[PDB]
Amino acid sequence: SMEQVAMELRLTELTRLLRSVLDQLQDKDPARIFAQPVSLKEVPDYLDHIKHPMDFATMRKRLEAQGYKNLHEFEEDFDLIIDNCMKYNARDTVFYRAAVRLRDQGGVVLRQARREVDSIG
Numbered sequence: 001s002m003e004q005v006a007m008e009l010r011l012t013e014l015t016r017l018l019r020s021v022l023d024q025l026q027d028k029d030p031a032r033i034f035a036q037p038v039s040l041k042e043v044p045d046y047l048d049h050i051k052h053p054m055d056f057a058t059m060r061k062r063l064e065a066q067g068y069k070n071l072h073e074f075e076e077d078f079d080l081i082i083d084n085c086m087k088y089n090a091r092d093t094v095f096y097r098a099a100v101r102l103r104d105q106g107g108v109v110l111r112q113a114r115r116e117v118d119s120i121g
Contacts, residue, residue: 010121011066011069012066013120014068014069014070014071014117015063015064015066015068017113017116017117017120018063018068018071018074019063021074021109021110021113022056022059022060022063022074024109025056025078025102025106025109025110026056028101028102028105028106028109029056029098029102031094031098033085033094033095033098033099034055034056034081034085034098034099034102035055035056035057036055036056036057037053037055037057037058038050038053038055046088049087049088050084050087050088052080052084053080053084054077054080054081054084055081056081058077059074059077059078059081062077070117071113071114071117075110078106078110081099081102082099082102082103082106085098085099086099086100
């Protein structure tokens with residue numbers, strides 16, 4: 001149907017915007033602390049602590065299969081990145097502090113992205 005095609009064009013356009021949002025969020029992590037999943041080889045207890053691991057590469061794979069239906073879903077995965085880090089790592093660590101900075105900086109990007117997703121529809 002033409003209705004389905006038009007839904008697909010909307011998903012594709014959301015996917016384009018979200019890809020730019022993702023690159024902008026990832027520049028707020030120049031150290032690349034959140035670029036890849038936490039290795040179970042190097043933190044074998046990780047899944048005892050953190051029930052839903054998330055990282056930028058995993059977000060990217062989901063994105064390129066157009067697996068984000070809306071900005072809320074994407075924000076959930078972003079928030080997991082930050083929130084997981086701030087529970088597993090202590091306040092006095094390079095990791096926790098890198099999450100704070102990503103959160104603060106990312107919030108600016110997401111504030112406008114939310115207006116662009118409403119605005120462009």
